[PDB]
């Protein structure tokens, strides 16, 4: 089970951690992927997941996208989980890098809500470029079930557990 988190609300937990480690090693019914439209896991956290499956969340995910067209930028998508979880949920937050809307990161949270508990990482944040701390605020303020959150970063993760208030 999750060991180690910082609780920080009610429903919400925060570890420095690697999502993949922590996947690897908790094996929840749920991670969730910082996916794009495409399911084109190349960096960040969709590279690191889509390298521990050996490329499996990949072919899979080409499939999905072959039958059903890309997400929506808010959206997401239930796959395999692979030999990390059960399943994972590709959640689809906005990249500020590419333009697009800051306001669907709380679409993009929403997802969460369909599952009683997830791993995951902060939505946007990374090499999608918003800023973590308003993600974290997004995520307790829009998440109602269990949600772990992993973040690699440890300065990071200091700076968020110093600013949450
Ligand atoms: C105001 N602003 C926008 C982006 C940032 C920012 O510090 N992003 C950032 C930088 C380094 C690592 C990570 C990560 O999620 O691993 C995120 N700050």
């Known amino acids: 089970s999750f060991s180690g988190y910082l609780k920080l609300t009610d429903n919400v937990y925060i570890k420095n951690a690697d999502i993949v480690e922590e996947a690897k090693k908790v094996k929840p019914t749920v991670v ?3 996916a794009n439209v495409y399911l084109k896991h190349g960096g960040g956290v969709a590279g690191a997941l889509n390298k521990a499956t050996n490329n499996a969340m990949q072919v899979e995910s080409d499939d999905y996208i072959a039958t059903n067209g890309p997400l929506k930028v808010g959206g997401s998508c239930v796959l395999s989980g692979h030999n990390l979880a059960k399943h994972c949920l590709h959640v ?23 599952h009683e508990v997830l791993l995951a990482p902060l939505l946007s944040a990374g090499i999608f470029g918003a800023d973590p701390i308003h993600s ?6 829009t998440v109602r079930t269990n949600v772990y959150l992993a973040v690699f970063d440890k300065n990071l993760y200091d700076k968020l557990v110093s ?3």
């Open 32 to 34: 969730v992927n910082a």
């Open 92 to 114: 689809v937050g906005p990249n500020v890098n590419k333009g697009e809307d800051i306001q669907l990161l709380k679409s993009a949270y929403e997802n969460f809500n369909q």
């Open 136 to 141: 974290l605020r997004v995520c307790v303020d």
């Open 163 to 165: 600013s949450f208030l």
